[PDB]
A paper describes a structure:
CE2 enzymes are acetyl esterases (that are generally not appended to other catalytic modules), which are reported to be active on synthetic aryl-esters and acetylated xylan. The C-terminal domains possess an atypical α/β-hydrolase (SGNH-hydrolase) fold, consisting of repeating β-α-β motifs that form a curved central five-stranded parallel β-sheet, in the strand order β2, β1, β3, β4, and β5 with strand β2 interrupted by loop insertion.
The bacterium Clostridium thermocellum contains a single CE2 member, designated CtCE2, which is linked to the cellulase, CtCel5C, within the modular protein designated CtCel5C-CE2. The structure of the α/β-hydrolase domain of CtCE2 revealed a deep cleft. The structure of both wild-type CtCE2 and the S612A mutant were determined in the presence of cellohexaose and clear electron density for five β-1,4-linked d-glucose molecules was observed in the cleft, consistent with the affinities revealed by ITC. In CtCE2, interaction of cellohexaose with the hydrophobic platform is augmented by several polar contacts. Notably, the O6 of Glc-4 makes a hydrogen bond with Oγ of Ser-612 (in one of its two conformations) in the wild-type esterase and Nɛ2 of His-791 in the S612A mutant, while O6 of Glc-2 interacts with Oɛ1 of Gln-780. As was revealed in the 3-D complex structure and discussed in more detail below, cellooligosaccharide binding, with a stoichiometry of 1, occurs across the esterase active centre with both the Ser and His of the dyad influencing ligand recognition.
Residue numbers in the entry: 10 to 334
The structure:
Amino acid sequence: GILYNGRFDFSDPNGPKCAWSGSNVELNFYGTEASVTIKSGGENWFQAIVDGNPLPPFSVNATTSTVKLVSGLAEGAHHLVLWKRTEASLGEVQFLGFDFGSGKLLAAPKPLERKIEFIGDSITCAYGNEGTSKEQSFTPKNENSYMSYAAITARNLNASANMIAWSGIGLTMNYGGAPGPLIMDRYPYTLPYSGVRWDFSKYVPQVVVINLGTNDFSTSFADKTKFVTAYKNLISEVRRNYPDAHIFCCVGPMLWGTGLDLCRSYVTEVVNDCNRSGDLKVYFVEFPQQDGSTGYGEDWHPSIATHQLMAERLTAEIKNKLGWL
Ligand SMILES: OC[C@H]1O[C@@H](O[C@H]2[C@H](O)[C@@H](O)[C@H](O[C@H]3[C@H](O)[C@@H](O)[C@H](O[C@H]4[C@H](O)[C@@H](O)[C@H](O[C@H]5[C@H](O)[C@@H](O)[C@H](O)O[C@@H]5CO)O[C@@H]4CO)O[C@@H]3CO)O[C@@H]2CO)[C@H](O)[C@@H](O)[C@@H]1O
């Protein structure tokens, strides 16, 4: 009856729980209106997309609330997507039930056959993408993962996407060397704060996109051996979960100067080594450095325009390798 698109935990009979950016619930209903009850651990933001039209977003902040998603529609069958805009670090969310007024739930859409997993950091979270000032610091309201390069690429390809991304995370270090779990430590989890492990058999993508290393080179440059080994470890893990996946290793568009040259050198070394070792389904993609001609979001993170450029590039790369025309 309902599609739960993402890494969801179903252990609580009161309602499915999720954390990662871009987690979304998708359903068909008959009627004129729809409501949902949401519990949120922090300041999470959502958007309802109803018959293909995105509605003004709303937050549910460290509380449980019943929210009217849409109303006053022509009575009939409608398609609804409820999208978690904000990232896992802003808290787990539990969906406690829908209400359709005098209407009803209808058969759910067929799940998409094409599947992508994205693994990344602030760029894939779409940190700050609805801010237009690079001087402004992070606000949850301005983080719109629906307009991340990852979400846009998935819609371009008629694919579902799981967005396994955490702002500031790296392969060898987090932003500014702040201590914390690194990507390989969070990657195994459905709910990374509470230790609920993800069962990798539940979602086997044909494509994995990795965009990591910005935090490894934006302040103090990571050690080459350490970084290359860490990146290889991650690819090994992805390959062990998904023997048949095409893996796209991506650099850009936030790195600049020497940090960008070193990151490019190290990641292309990783890809070339995987290829020589016999894995021909590991590829490299570079998003050209943002130069200001497409503006900036909060803390210099990519604008929606820059996300759109990335999505055009990445869509064409995946179409090429997969034949996903
Ligand atoms: O609060 C939520 C979340 O925060 C995480 O930490 C955030 C941190 O709070 C931010 O301050 C930080 O922002 C920095 C970016 O990561 C970093 O990439 C960016 O670096 C700039 C650089 O400052 C700037 O000089 C550079 O300019 C270049 C131009 O882009 C080029 O065109 C030109 O040729 O060259 C110049 C430089 O010569 O641009 C780059 C980016 O392109 O600076 C930001 C700070 O100013 O981001 C962190 C990670 O998201 C924290 O980790 C979380 O735990 C926390 O929840």
